[PDB]
Amino acid sequence: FLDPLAYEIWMCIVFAYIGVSVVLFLVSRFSPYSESTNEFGIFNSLWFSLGAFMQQGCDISPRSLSGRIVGGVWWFFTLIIISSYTANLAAFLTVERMVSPIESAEDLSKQTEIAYGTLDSGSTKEFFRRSKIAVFDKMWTYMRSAEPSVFVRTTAEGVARVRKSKGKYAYLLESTMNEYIEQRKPCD
Amino acid sequence: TNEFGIFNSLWFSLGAFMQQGCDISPRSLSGRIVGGVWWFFTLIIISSYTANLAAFLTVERMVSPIESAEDLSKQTEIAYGTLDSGSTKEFFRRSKIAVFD
Amino acid sequence: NLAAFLTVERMVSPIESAEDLSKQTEIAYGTLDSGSTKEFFRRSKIAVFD
Amino acid sequence: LFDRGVQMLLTTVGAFAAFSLMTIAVGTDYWLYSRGVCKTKKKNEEVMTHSGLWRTCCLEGNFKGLCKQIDHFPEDADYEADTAEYFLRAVRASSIFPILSVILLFMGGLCIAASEFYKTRHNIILSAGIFFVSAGLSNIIGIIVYISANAGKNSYSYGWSFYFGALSFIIAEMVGVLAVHMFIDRHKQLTG
Amino acid sequence: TMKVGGNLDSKGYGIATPKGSSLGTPVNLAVLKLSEQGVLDKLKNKWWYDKGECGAKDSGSKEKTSALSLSNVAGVFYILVGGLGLAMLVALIEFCYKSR
Amino acid sequence: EGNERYEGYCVDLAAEIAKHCGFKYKLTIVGDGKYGARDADTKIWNGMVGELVYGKADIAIAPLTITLVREEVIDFSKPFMSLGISIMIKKPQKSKPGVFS
Ligand SMILES: NS(=O)(=O)c1cc2c(cc1Cl)N[C@H]([C@H]1C[C@H]3C=C[C@@H]1C3)NS2(=O)=O
Ligand SMILES: C[C@]12C[C@@H]3C[C@](C)(C1)C[C@@](N)(C3)C2
Ligand SMILES: N[C@@H](CCC(=O)O)C(=O)O
Ligand SMILES: N[C@@H](CCC(=O)O)C(=O)O
């Protein structure tokens, strides 16, 4: 639930609450005169500044001019930070997906940040070697121009190079052999 | 009848707009209307205003120091030039347009 | 619901690139008659044009 | 209000404790863990960085503890004409507010010493509490400028000597509370 | 490094030959035939647009956030600390009012 | 040596044209490294334009731009597509929103 705001701001805003938690007290204790003439002690300044922070609280209030000044300013502060909490969850409760390049191998046919290869000496290599569909033909043009060799002579080597490359190497293979690496631990 | 100074009337609806309470209340005919409707203002304004707050805080625009390609004519702290013996160089020599000239 | 408003203006704003147009009868379309666009669609074999 | 008789000791020791922590925080050459350089050009690409307030320094570099006092630095690609950026750099070259806080807390020492020297002429003993709040503000603005500069995720980590910058604020305001608990009766004892 | 501004001219490239060289007419006819074949844009994709491999292809529009930070909202602390300064200054001056 | 050293838009379009019209071709580099213009003193054309005008080459296939002065000494074909003048600068970073934004 703290995700929308950084660690350091949650840490430091406490210091601002402390500040208002005693600035009301200093404001109130300048020469009330009777001694009783100014209400807010430390514990009530702390409380009213909290009821400002975490909202709610319908029971106490300072009559001082400087008191209502700092109260209004601290309310203005709180409105901003708390409503910013209420907003930024929109960036978390929507578009939560992590990352997923790429569908249809669209980006693979166009960029070299992710290497890819087929099984060597296999039906898929020969298919890319011939298939004239533009995405397939261009992926073949890469693999034929890709150096060092991208083709794996075993599915074991394919899976190994995919894993060791953290997904920067993508392995092209038949989907049931592919899905035996998804329905099975470590399923990464 | 009213626990109000002018500074109180200047304060109570501020706190109400901040959506937090203060010990005083209108407690009167035609004071109900003024205090209560003022909630509607913050209830719509704040709610709507405080919704894109986060996004706005990260818009990450660019300042675009020049955009018209003629701003460079206005200044010399930024130098500019063209390819020597180049088509653009000789065009700027040849194309006798004041903005270009 | 105010978020459901301000998060989205673009419902579909009909079809770009004539992609879904090429794949629907729900919107009719044509070129100018007796024109080089008409001839271009007559000859250009690119999938959307053809 | 309680322990009315001992509060002069408790306040004077609390003030000296706050002054000690404040000057340790200002004087310590390291505050937090970061990435950067050991020196004002360990210096080639990056190093684990172990700088303090006025001093830039590193940890687990090819050398350690050869820290340096910071100096003014320029900026790249504009945005320096803004008064907030310019003033942030002018402060970062030599952070005024922490040492001003040291000076205010020392002047609070003089104010509480003015309980005895030329003893308590009028309500002067109030001034310590004002100095302690102003020291609090000087610390909090120091922290705000320090973070808002150096945090520009950061992947940093914060050491105890960083947190002493905060704790010296928390304690300075507790000494403020003690100074008020002194003044509010001491000035009544002076003036009835 | 970045494009700013835009075209000053409706100019362009062309294939060129010695003046009166026999290549000019087959060149021009091939240039025309290539246009309806759509080769020219696919060469342009292959030599500019596919090669847009930098994250600037996407980084200006990506989803979610790395959480919000102090420096984006830090000015809110300035108006507070200034209010606390005023909260001191008011007492500092009202002393002289009570001293009257 | 022949044509496989070179890669690029003009290299490919050169291959496509020479295949389409079925003529043997040899890519070669201008000796002076210039695109080409007439010397203001000697009127001698340098660059690839010189290479054509003085028989050093048989056809030019390059980003050598169409100009009217070049059309005085060479023939430019129909164009494949247009382009125009532009400015290159180092971009400023994406702007962190204002302190009070
Ligand atoms: N779309 S583009 O920028 O890549 C572009 C630009 C141009 C192309 C072709 C393309 Cl693909 N050729 C046409 C020419 C073809 C013939 C018809 C007009 C000219 C002759 N004009 S153009 O302006 O020289
Ligand atoms: C209901 C609430 C809950 C929290 C977020 C909103 C936006 C809506 C403001 C509020 N004051 C605090 C009241
Ligand atoms: N079983 C496949 C393995 C190689 C491939 O999947 O391309 C074949 O017979 O060729
Ligand atoms: N293509 C241009 C390059 C130089 C320029 O545009 O200035 C030319 O033929 O000269």
PDB file of N, CA and C and ligand atoms in Angstrom, chain A residues 54-55 79 82-83 85-87, chain B residues 18-19 46-47 50, ligand 2:
ATOM      1  N   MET A  54      -3.849  12.469   9.135  1.00  0.00           N
ATOM      2  CA  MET A  54      -4.649  11.263   8.788  1.00  0.00           C
ATOM      3  C   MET A  54      -6.127  11.637   8.611  1.00  0.00           C
ATOM      4  N   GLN A  55      -6.432  12.935   8.502  1.00  0.00           N
ATOM      5  CA  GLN A  55      -7.835  13.412   8.333  1.00  0.00           C
ATOM      6  C   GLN A  55      -8.673  13.041   9.571  1.00  0.00           C
ATOM      7  N   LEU A  79      -3.517  17.989   2.204  1.00  0.00           N
ATOM      8  CA  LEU A  79      -4.397  17.772   1.064  1.00  0.00           C
ATOM      9  C   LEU A  79      -3.589  17.300  -0.139  1.00  0.00           C
ATOM     10  N   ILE A  82      -1.723  13.620   0.612  1.00  0.00           N
ATOM     11  CA  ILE A  82      -2.674  12.519   0.725  1.00  0.00           C
ATOM     12  C   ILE A  82      -3.442  12.327  -0.579  1.00  0.00           C
ATOM     13  N   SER A  83      -3.883  13.411  -1.223  1.00  0.00           N
ATOM     14  CA  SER A  83      -4.543  13.232  -2.507  1.00  0.00           C
ATOM     15  C   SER A  83      -3.587  12.670  -3.549  1.00  0.00           C
ATOM     16  N   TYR A  85      -1.367  10.424  -2.847  1.00  0.00           N
ATOM     17  CA  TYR A  85      -1.544   8.995  -2.595  1.00  0.00           C
ATOM     18  C   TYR A  85      -2.786   8.466  -3.303  1.00  0.00           C
ATOM     19  N   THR A  86      -3.915   9.154  -3.122  1.00  0.00           N
ATOM     20  CA  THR A  86      -5.178   8.732  -3.728  1.00  0.00           C
ATOM     21  C   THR A  86      -5.113   8.688  -5.252  1.00  0.00           C
ATOM     22  N   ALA A  87      -4.236   9.486  -5.855  1.00  0.00           N
ATOM     23  CA  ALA A  87      -4.074   9.501  -7.306  1.00  0.00           C
ATOM     24  C   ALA A  87      -3.185   8.369  -7.805  1.00  0.00           C
TER      25      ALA A  87
ATOM     26  N   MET B  18     -10.603  22.616   3.060  1.00  0.00           N
ATOM     27  CA  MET B  18      -9.587  21.611   3.351  1.00  0.00           C
ATOM     28  C   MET B  18     -10.177  20.281   3.804  1.00  0.00           C
ATOM     29  N   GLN B  19     -11.503  20.191   3.939  1.00  0.00           N
ATOM     30  CA  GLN B  19     -12.189  18.973   4.373  1.00  0.00           C
ATOM     31  C   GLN B  19     -11.711  18.508   5.745  1.00  0.00           C
ATOM     32  N   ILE B  46     -12.083  19.947  -5.508  1.00  0.00           N
ATOM     33  CA  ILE B  46     -10.927  19.154  -4.987  1.00  0.00           C
ATOM     34  C   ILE B  46     -10.957  17.761  -5.636  1.00  0.00           C
ATOM     35  N   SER B  47     -12.062  17.025  -5.483  1.00  0.00           N
ATOM     36  CA  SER B  47     -12.137  15.644  -6.027  1.00  0.00           C
ATOM     37  C   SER B  47     -11.567  15.612  -7.452  1.00  0.00           C
ATOM     38  N   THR B  50      -7.752  17.085  -7.603  1.00  0.00           N
ATOM     39  CA  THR B  50      -6.839  16.100  -6.982  1.00  0.00           C
ATOM     40  C   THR B  50      -7.153  14.716  -7.509  1.00  0.00           C
TER      41      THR B  50
HETATM   42  C1  LIG G   2     -12.985   9.599   0.836  1.00  0.00           C
HETATM   43  C2  LIG G   2     -11.586  10.176   0.673  1.00  0.00           C
HETATM   44  C3  LIG G   2     -10.532   9.168   1.149  1.00  0.00           C
HETATM   45  C4  LIG G   2      -9.127   9.748   0.983  1.00  0.00           C
HETATM   46  C5  LIG G   2      -8.880  10.071  -0.489  1.00  0.00           C
HETATM   47  C6  LIG G   2      -9.910  11.091  -0.990  1.00  0.00           C
HETATM   48  C7  LIG G   2      -9.657  11.416  -2.455  1.00  0.00           C
HETATM   49  C8  LIG G   2     -11.312  10.503  -0.800  1.00  0.00           C
HETATM   50  C9  LIG G   2      -9.797  12.363  -0.143  1.00  0.00           C
HETATM   51  C10 LIG G   2     -10.044  12.060   1.336  1.00  0.00           C
HETATM   52  N1  LIG G   2      -9.970  13.308   2.089  1.00  0.00           N
HETATM   53  C11 LIG G   2      -9.010  11.029   1.808  1.00  0.00           C
HETATM   54  C12 LIG G   2     -11.445  11.464   1.491  1.00  0.00           C
END
